[PDB]
Design a protein around this ligand. Structure first.
Ligand code: CHL
Ligand code: CHL
Ligand code: CHL
Ligand code: CHL
Ligand code: CLA
Ligand code: CLA
Ligand code: CLA
Ligand SMILES: CC1=C[C@H](O)CC(C)(C)[C@H]1/C=C/C(C)=C/C=C/C(C)=C/C=C/C=C(C)/C=C/C=C(\CO)C(=O)CC1=C(C)C[C@@H](O)CC1(C)C
Ligand SMILES: CC1=C[C@H](O)CC(C)(C)[C@H]1/C=C/C(C)=C/C=C/C(C)=C/C=C/C=C(C)/C=C/C=C(\CO)C(=O)CC1=C(C)C[C@@H](O)CC1(C)C
Ligand SMILES: CC1=C[C@H](O)CC(C)(C)[C@H]1/C=C/C(C)=C/C=C/C(C)=C/C=C/C=C(C)/C=C/C=C(\CO)C(=O)CC1=C(C)C[C@@H](O)CC1(C)C
Ligand SMILES: CC1=C[C@H](O)CC(C)(C)[C@H]1/C=C/C(C)=C/C=C/C(C)=C/C=C/C=C(C)/C=C/C=C(\CO)C(=O)CC1=C(C)C[C@@H](O)CC1(C)C
Lengths: 221, 218, 212
C-alpha cells in the first residue's frame, strides 16, 4: 500500500533508500523509517517508544487545542478570560478570584491550588493505572488501541480503515507535537501567545518574523 | 596499538574490567569507553558511530570557523563587523550587512530569509546524497567513508594507512568536539570569544582561571 | 518473598501487571518493575544502568547528608560557617578568610581553589580506577559490592541478610536521589537552603509551599 510495507512513503522521499533501518519494515503506523539514532533497534524498546509516542501525540493534540482555544476566544470573540495566554493560565490560581471558566465567576471558580493538585493526582493515578492495567472501561484490549468503551462510534471496525485511521492519528499527533514544541519555543523567546504570534505574523510577515534581534539574542532564556 | 585486544583503552593501566565485551577494538577510536551501555546493540553501535563521526567532522569545521575570524580581527588586520563566533550571526541585522572579511564588495548579505532557505535547500540535497548517494557517488562506503570522489588525493589507498588515518580522524574529531563544548561553555559563562579568553589566560594565568564566574550556572 | 521473585512489591501496586517488562524478573535489588521507556531491555545495558544507579544512589546519600549537616549545624547547633548553605558552600573559597572547616580558623583553612581541584582530580581518579579494576583495597571482585575491605563489620556474611541489606541500600539511595533532585529544584526556585525551607514550611505550612 502507501503507508505500510516496503513500498510505503519514507521520511526522506527519493533520498531515503539506504537510510531505512532494517527493523523498520512498515508494520506499525507512522513508519517513515526515521531511526537515524538507532534508539528503537530493540523490539521491546521499539514498542515502548511506540507507546510513548502515541501517548505524547494524543496529549499534544489535546494540549494544542486547549492552548489555542482560550486565546483565540479572547481576541476574536468577546470572551473575557483573566489570562487567556496558555503559559500564563496557571497563574490565575494565585489571583483574587482564581480560575473562572470562560471568565464567569459562577463556573468552577477555583480558589485553592491544593485541592486541584490532589484531585488531579488521584484521578490521573487511577486513570493511568487503568490504562496500564485495565479497569471499569475494559480489562484486556490493546495498551494503545483498546476500543470497545473508547470507540463508541464504531469507526475502527474495518481493518483497512482502522489502519488508515491509525496513520491519520499518528501523523496528526506528530504535527501537534511539533506545534507544541513551537509553542514552548515561542513562549520562551517571544513571551507572547501563539494566537498573538500568528496575528502579528499575518499582519507583517516580513517584519514580524522569527528572525529578530531581540528574539534571537538569547538561547532558551 | 589502536586495534585489537592489546590496544590503548580509555582508563589506561586501570582499564581491565572497564572495557565492555562488545568493544573488541574493531572500529576506529575504540578506547573501550562505554559505561552506560548505550552502544551494546551492534545496530545502535553503528548508528552511534555514524553520529559520532558526523559530529566530529562538523566540530573540526566549527573550531576553525570560530577561531579564524577572531584571530584575523585581533592578531591580523581584518575588520569584521562581528569577530566573535557567538555574535557573528547578529551581523546579518546590521546597516552594512553581512560583509565577508569586512569587505563590502564580498558577499554583502542583506536578507536572512533568503540565506536560511537556500541553506535549507542545499543542505537537504547534500544530506540526502550523503545517506542515499547522488551525483558525486552512489554511497559505496559505510556512509562515513565514501571515498572515490571525496578522496581525490588517494591518501586512503592502503588499508593500514587507511586505519591509521581513521584513528587520527576520530581522535582529532573528538578533540574538536571537546573544544567546541568548551567554546559553548566559555561563551555562556564569560561571554567572550575563545581567542580573547585564551589571550587573557596567557597574560595572568593564575588569576583568570575558570574559577571566577563559577556562580550563575549557565 | 516480598522484594524478590515473581510476587514482588511493584511500582504500581495493584495496577502493575501488564506494565512490568518481561526482562525484569526480580533478580536484582530494588526490582519494582519500573521500566516504561525500555531503557534496560538489553541485559548488558541493564547491568550498566544498575551500576550507574547504585553509584548515583551512594553519591546522593553522601551528598544529602553533607548538604544537611552544615546548615543544620549553623541554624540549630551554633557553629558559624562562612557559607553553611549547600549551594553557597563552594563560594567561600573566594572569600578573604578562605574555606575554614567548621568555621574554626585552625582547621583546613583552604586558600586556593586550584590546589583543591587538582588534588581532588588525582585522588578521585585513583579511587575510580581502583573501583573499576581493583587496587590496594581489593581486586574488584564485584563492581558494586566488592566486600572484604569495604565490609569490615561483616554484616553481609549471610546471603538472606545480604539481599535484604542490598534492597535497603538501593531504596535509601533512590530516596536520597529524589531528595537531591528536590534540593536542586528548591535551590533554583526558592534560592534558600533546604533546612531553611523545612523550617519555614514547619512554621506556616498552609502558605509557604511550592505554589507561591
Ligand atoms: C527529498 C527531500 C526531503 C528532505 C531533504 C527531507 C528532510 C526531512 N524530513 Mg522529510 N524530507 C524530504 C522529503 C519528504 N519528507 C517526507 C515526510 C516527512 C515526515 C513525516 C517527517 C519528515 C522529517 C524530515 C526532517 C528529518 C530530519 C531533520 O529533523 O532535520 C532537521 C535537522 C537539522 C540539523 C536542520 C538544520 C537546518 C536548519 C536551517 C537550521 C536552522 C538554523 C537556525 C537559525 C540555527 C539555530 C540556532 C541555534 C540555537 C541552534 C528533514 C527536514 C521529520 C520532521 O519533520 O522532523 C523535524 C518528520 O516527521 N519528512 C515526505 C513524504 C513521504 C517527503 C516526500 O518527498
Ligand atoms: C590511569 C589514569 C587515567 C584516568 C584516571 C583517566 C580518566 C579519564 N580518561 Mg583517560 N584516564 C587515564 C589514563 C588514560 N586515558 C587515556 C585516553 C583517554 C581518552 C581518549 C579519553 C579519556 C577520557 C577519560 C575520562 C573519562 C571519564 C570522565 O569523563 O570523567 C569525568 C567525570 C567526572 C565526574 C570528573 C570531574 C571532576 C571535576 C573536578 C568535577 C568538578 C566539577 C566542577 C569543578 C564544578 C561542578 C559544576 C556544577 C556547577 C554543575 C577520565 C577523566 C575521555 C574524556 O576525556 O572525556 C571527558 C576520553 O575521550 N582518556 C590514555 C591513553 C590510552 C591513558 C593512558 O594511561
Ligand atoms: C552550528 C549550529 C549553530 C549554533 C551552535 C549557533 C549558535 C548561535 N547562533 Mg546561530 N547557530 C547555529 C547555526 C546558525 N545560526 C544562524 C544564524 C544566526 C543568527 C542571525 C543569530 C544567531 C545567533 C546564535 C546564538 C544564539 C543566541 C545566544 O545567545 O546563544 C547562547 C548562538 C551563539 C544570534 C546571535 O548571534 O546573537 C548574539 C543571532 O542573531 N544565529 C544560521 C543561518 C540561518 C545557522 C545555520 O545553520
Ligand atoms: C556534586 C556535584 C557538584 C554540584 C551539583 C555543584 C553545584 C554547584 N557548585 Mg560546585 N558543585 C559540584 C562539585 C564541585 N563544586 C566545586 C567548587 C565550586 C565553587 C568554587 C563554586 C561552586 C558553585 C556551585 C554552584 C554553581 C552556581 C549556580 O548557579 O548553582 C545552580 C546549580 C545547581 C542548582 C546544580 C545543577 C547541576 C546539576 C543538578 C548537577 C549535574 C552536574 C554534576 C556533574 C559533575 C552549584 C550549586 C559556585 C557557587 O557556590 O555560587 C553560589 C561557586 O563559586 N562549586 C568543586 C571543587 C573543584 C566540586 C568538586 O567536585
Ligand atoms: C490537555 C487538555 C487540557 C488541559 C489540561 C486544559 C487546562 C485548562 N483549561 Mg482548557 N481546553 C481544552 C483542553 C485542556 N485545557 C480543550 C480541548 C478546549 C476546547 C473545548 C479547552 C477550552 C477551555 C476554555 C474555554 C477555558 C479553558 C480553561 C482552562 C484552565 C482552567 C482549568 C479548568 O477550569 O478546567 C476544569 C473545567 C471543568 C472540569 C469543566 C486550565 C489551564 C479556562 C481558562 O482559564 O483559560 C485560560 C477557560 O476559560 N479551557
Ligand atoms: C581542549 C580543551 C580545552 C582547552 C584547551 C580549554 C582552555 C581554556 N578554557 Mg576551557 N573548557 C573546556 C575545554 C577546554 N578549555 C570544556 C570542555 C569546558 C566545559 C566544561 C570548558 C569550560 C570553561 C570555562 C567555564 C572557562 C574556561 C576557560 C578556559 C581558559 C582558561 C583556562 C581555564 O580556566 O580552564 C578551565 C578548564 C575547564 C573548566 C575544563 C578543562 C578540562 C580539560 C583539563 C585537562 C583556557 C583558554 C576560562 C576562560 O574563559 O578563561 C578566561 C573559563 O571561565 N573553560
Ligand atoms: C559526598 C560527600 C561530601 C562532599 C563532597 C562534601 C563537601 C564539602 N563539605 Mg561536607 N560532609 C559530608 C559529606 C560531604 N561533604 C558528610 C557526610 C558530613 C557529616 C559528617 C559532612 C560534614 C561537613 C562539615 C561539618 C563541614 C563540611 C564542609 C564541606 C565543604 C568543604 C570541605 C572541607 O573542607 O572538608 C575537607 C576536610 C577533611 C577531609 C578533613 C565541601 C563543600 C565544611 C564547609 O564549609 O561546608 C559549609 C564544613 O564545615 N562538611
Ligand atoms: C524519530 C526519531 C528518530 C531518531 O533516530 C532519533 C530522534 C530524532 C530523537 C527521534 C525523534 C523524536 C522527536 C522529534 C522528538 C520530539 C518530541 C516532542 C517535541 C514532543 C512534544 C510533546 C508535546 C506535548 C505532550 C504537549 C502537551 C501539552 C499540554 C498537555 O496536554 C497542554 O497544553 C496542557 C495545557 C493546556 C491545554 C492549557 C494551558 O493553559 C496549560 C497547559 C497545562 C500547558
Ligand atoms: C563515550 C561514552 C560512553 C559512555 O558509556 C556514555 C557517554 C559518556 C555519554 C559517552 C560519551 C559521549 C560524549 C562525551 C558526548 C559528547 C558530545 C559532544 C560534546 C558533541 C559536540 C559537538 C560539537 C559540534 C558539532 C560543534 C559544531 C560547531 C559548528 C557547526 O559546524 C560551528 O561552529 C558553526 C559556526 C561557525 C563555524 C562560525 C560561527 O560564527 C557560527 C557557527 C554556526 C556557530
Ligand atoms: C593519565 C595519562 C597518561 C597518558 O600517558 C597520557 C594521558 C592520557 C594524557 C594522561 C591522562 C590524563 C587524564 C585522563 C587526566 C584527567 C584530567 C581531569 C579529569 C581534569 C579535570 C578538571 C576539571 C576542572 C578544571 C573543572 C573546573 C570547573 C570549573 C572551572 O571553569 C567550573 O567553574 C565549573 C562550572 C561551573 C561552576 C558553572 C557552569 O555553568 C560551568 C562549569 C564550567 C561546569
Ligand atoms: C526507573 C526508570 C524507568 C523508565 O523506563 C525510564 C526512567 C523514568 C527514565 C527511569 C527513571 C529514572 C529516574 C527517575 C532518574 C532520576 C535521577 C536522579 C534524580 C538522580 C539524582 C542524583 C543526585 C546526586 C547524585 C546528588 C549528589 C550530591 C552531591 C555529590 O555527592 C553533593 O551534594 C556533594 C556536595 C555536598 C555534600 C556539599 C555541598 O556544599 C557541595 C556539593 C558538592 C553539592
Amino acid at each position: 500500500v502507501e503507508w505500510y510495507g516496503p513500498g510505503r512513503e519514507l521520511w526522506l522521499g527519493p533520498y531515503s533508500s539506504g537510510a531505512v533501518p532494517s527493523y523498520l519494515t512498515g508494520e506499525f503506523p507512522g513508519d517513515y523509517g526515521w531511526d537515524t539514532a538507532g534508539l528503537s533497534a530493540d523490539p521491546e524498546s521499539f514498542r515502548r517508544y511506540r507507546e510513548i509516542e502515541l501517548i505524547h501525540a494524543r496529549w499534544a493534540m489535546m494540549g494544542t487545542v486547549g492552548c489555542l482555544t482560550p486565546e483565540a476566544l479572547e481576541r476574536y470573540t468577546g470572551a473575557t478570560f483573566g489570562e487567556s495566554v496558555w503559559f500564563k493560565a496557571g497563574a490565575q490560581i494565585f489571583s483574587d478570584d482564581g480560575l473562572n471558566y470562560l471568565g464567569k465567576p459562577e463556573l468552577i471558580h477555583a480558589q485553592s491550588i491544593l485541592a486541584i493538585v490532589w484531585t488531579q493526582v488521584l484521578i490521573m493515578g487511577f486513570a493511568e493505572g487503568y490504562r496500564v492495567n485495565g479497569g471499569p472501561a475494559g480489562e484486556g484490549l490493546d495498551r494503545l488501541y483498546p476500543g470497545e468503551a473508547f470507540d463508541p462510534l464504531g469507526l475502527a471496525d474495518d481493518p483497512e480503515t482502522f489502519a488508515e485511521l491509525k496513520i491519520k492519528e499518528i501523523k496528526n499527533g506528530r504535527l501537534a507535537m511539533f506545534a507544541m514544541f513551537g509553542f514552548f519555543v515561542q513562549a520562551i523567546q517571544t513571551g507572547k501567545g501563539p494566537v498573538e504570534c500568528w496575528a502579528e505574523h499575518v499582519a507583517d510577515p516580513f517584519g514580524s518574523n522569527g528572525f529578530n534581534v531581540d528574539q534571537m539574542s538569547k538561547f532558551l532564556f | 596499538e589502536w586495534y585489537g585486544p592489546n590496544r590503548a583503552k580509555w582508563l589506561g593501566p586501570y582499564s581491565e574490567g572497564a572495557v565492555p565485551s562488545y568493544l573488541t577494538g574493531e572500529f576506529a577510536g575504540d578506547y573501550g569507553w562505554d559505561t552506560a551501555g548505550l552502544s551494546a546493540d551492534p545496530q545502535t553501535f553503528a548508528s552511534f558511530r555514524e553520529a559520532e563521526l558526523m559530529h566530529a567532522r562538523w566540530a573540526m569545521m566549527g573550531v576553525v570557523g570560530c577561531l579564524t575570524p577572531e584571530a584575523l580581527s585581533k592578531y591580523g588586520g581584518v575588520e569584521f563587523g562581528e569577530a566573535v563566533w557567538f555574535k557573528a550571526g547578529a551581523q546579518i541585522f546590521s546597516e552594512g550587512g553581512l560583509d565577508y572579511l569586512g569587505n563590502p564588495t564580498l558577499v554583502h548579505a542583506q536578507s536572512i530569509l533568503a540565506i536560511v532557505w537556500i541553506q535549507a535547500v542545499l543542505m537537504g540535497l547534500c544530506e540526502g546524497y550523503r545517506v542515499a548517494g547522488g551525483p558525486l557517488g552512489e554511497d559505496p562506503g559505510d556512509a562515513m567513508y565514501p571515498g572515490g570522489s571525496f578522496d581525490p588525493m588517494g591518501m586512503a589507498d592502503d588499508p593500514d594507512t587507511f586505519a591509521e588515518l581513521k584513528i587520527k580522524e576520530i581522535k582529532n574529531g573528538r578533540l574538536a568536539m571537546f573544544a567546541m563544548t568548551g567554546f559553548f561553555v566559555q561563551a555562556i559563562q564569560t561571554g567572550k570569544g575563545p581567542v580573547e579568553c585564551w589571550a587573557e589566560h596567557i597574560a595572568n594565568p593564575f588569576t583568570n582561571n575558570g574559577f571566577v564566574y563559577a556562580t550563575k550556572f549557565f | 518473598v516480598e522484594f524478590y521473585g515473581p510476587d514482588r512489591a511493584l511500582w504500581l501496586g495493584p495496577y502493575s501487571e501488564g506494565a512490568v517488562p518481561s526482562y525484569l524478573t526480580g533478580e536484582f535489588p530494588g526490582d519494582y518493575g519500573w521500566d516504561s521507556a525500555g531503557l534496560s531491555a538489553d541485559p548488558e545495558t541493564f547491568a550498566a544502568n544498575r551500576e550507574l544507579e547504585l553509584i548515583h544512589a551512594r553519591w546522593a546519600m553522601l551528598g544529602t547528608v553533607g548538604c544537611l549537616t552544615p546548615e543544620a549545624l549553623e541554624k540549630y547547633g551554633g557553629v558559624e560557617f562562612g557559607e553553611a548553605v549547600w549551594f553557597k558552600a563552594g563560594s567561600q573559597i573566594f572569600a578573604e578568610g578562605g574555606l575554614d572547616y567548621l568555621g574554626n580558623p585552625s582547621l583546613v583553612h583552604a586558600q586556593s581553589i586550584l590546589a583543591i581541584c587538582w588534588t581532588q582530580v588525582v585522588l578521585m581518579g585513583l579511587a575510580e580506577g581502583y573501583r573499576c579494576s581493583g587496587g590496594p583495597l581489593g581486586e574488584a571482585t564485584d563492581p558494586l559490592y566488592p566486600g572484604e575491605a569495604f565490609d569490615p563489620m561483616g554484616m553481609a556474611d549471610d546471603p538472606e541478610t545480604f539481599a535484604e541489606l542490598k534492597t535497603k541500600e538501593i531504596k535509601n539511595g533512590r530516596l536520597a536521589m529524589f531528595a537531591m533532585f528536590g534540593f536542586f529544584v528548591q535551590s533554583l526556585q526558592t534560592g534558600k537552603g533546604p533546612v531553611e525551607c523545612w523550617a519555614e514550611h514547619i512554621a506556616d505550612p498552609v502558605a509557604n509551599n511550592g505554589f507561591v
